[PDB]
Amino acid sequence: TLFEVVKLGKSAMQSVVDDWIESYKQDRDIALLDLINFFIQCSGCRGTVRIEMFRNMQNAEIIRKMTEEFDEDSGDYPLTMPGPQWKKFRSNFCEFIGVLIRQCQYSIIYDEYMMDTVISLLTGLSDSQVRAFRHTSTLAAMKLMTALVNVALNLSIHQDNTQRQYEAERNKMIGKRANERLELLLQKRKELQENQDEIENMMNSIFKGIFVHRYRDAIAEIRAICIEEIGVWMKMYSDAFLNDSYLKYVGWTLHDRQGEVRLKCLKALQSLYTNRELFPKLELFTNRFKDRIVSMTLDKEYDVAVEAIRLVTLILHGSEEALSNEDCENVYHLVYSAH
Amino acid sequence: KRKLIVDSVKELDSKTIRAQLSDYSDIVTTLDLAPPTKKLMMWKETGGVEKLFSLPAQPLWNNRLLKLFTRCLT
């Protein structure tokens, strides 16, 4: 009944998060079946995957079966149907998923089973020609990735804690239990490092299984979602992702055709650069794309131009070197815009 | 039967993006300046069919003269 619970005014998310975590400890298979049904039903489908079908049928046949029982009226689906109920549904959806993953980070993530199942299912839903599944899977997988970004931040922080205790014991060189605590801290640090390696591996799996197909989607909104969430992650875990290796994807998406996508990318770029008083890398990226940004200050959409001008304001704040005379003359002429 | 719009493929050709790389004019335009002189601004104030059609051709600086005029217009 999960879909109705998320839609019809749940009184608290954490309570059902805790109850589900306990029930998953009680039975992995039933709760996982409920999760599959959850992912299907967030797209509005009322079909049901059966227990034998769950354990035995391949994912492509399962998804095809759920196309049979899709029971749609039009080509509209809940992420495109209007009214406040579906937007509130999306908000509750992301809130529940993120709180659920964030409180389970010590057990469920390390079971070698859940992530493979979820990734395989979402990759098949995101590769399906049925647009509704592909859309819900895109937003869901972005939320999942953000939760994993929190996992990565928590893991790194814990590694720093065990490193600090290790260093304090590296100071404490005398003591029978000193060698014991040093070994246990090294063991924990190694286990967390290997766990971290698995986390980044899973991150890379998600990134190459989803993003590379979804940065180029036929639906402009999907591409915009992807750029939104990459901006979120780099704002969230800056120390590990803010390099050209990830910047290049943003560089490619700067050439989007649609204004809506440009507005989302522009807002993400504006938010990220303001985060640090002293610039964290990206200087090469700024050099590469600065001129095209200042040419994009004359977008047909006024909001895009606003975001562009604020970006140029950031370019001023960081450097004052990057701007040329002609840039200043052009913007000073833009002070007399009708808008 | 099955009134949902089916989508054949989601792939898009790279050449159109390469075209935007070679030619990005399709999202730019020319800067539309506001009127740079007083004359066109005062004309734009009392301009438009309603404003031109609702005030005399010879301006009346005192509203006392405005009430006799605006009174008689059905």
Next chain:
Amino acid sequence: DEANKIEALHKRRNLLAAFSKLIIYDIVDMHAAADIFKHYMKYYNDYGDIIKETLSKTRQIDKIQCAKTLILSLQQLFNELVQEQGPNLDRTSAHVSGIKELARRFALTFGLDQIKTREAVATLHKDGIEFAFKYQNQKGQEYPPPNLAFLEVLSEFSSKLLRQDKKTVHSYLEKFLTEQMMERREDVWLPLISYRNSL
């Protein structure tokens, strides 16, 4: 000469606006608005909005003298074209089709819901037929009217209304048309053919 042209055009606009105030005075008692109504397409960028507003503010105050000035406007347009082109009447030339296009523009304003559309447009067709037979023919033949190209304009208004009154207008029409005029169908009498197809 930029400033001079801008001031001259705006001054002209102000003068014409004062004349449109006089057009409201025309709605009460003046007349002879045919020329200002005629100059709607040739001067479209200068005066489209003002001519449209005059038409609207004459429709909402008095449909009767609205249809009067509309018919006198078309009379002026037809008399100018016939003087311009003489005997041939230049149906092939774009000008007359453009006047018919202006007639369609006039037609767009009219709305079926109005009662006066059910009786003013009727009078309009009455007077358009009367205008088509305004002048008699010297020779070849007594039937064929001269100034006859106005029925191509009136056929553009016969589309709008109305099934029941089509018989009533035809019973008015038989004061003007004859049996062998109704019967004959050739490329010169195509306006009548189209009128009967519209009736």
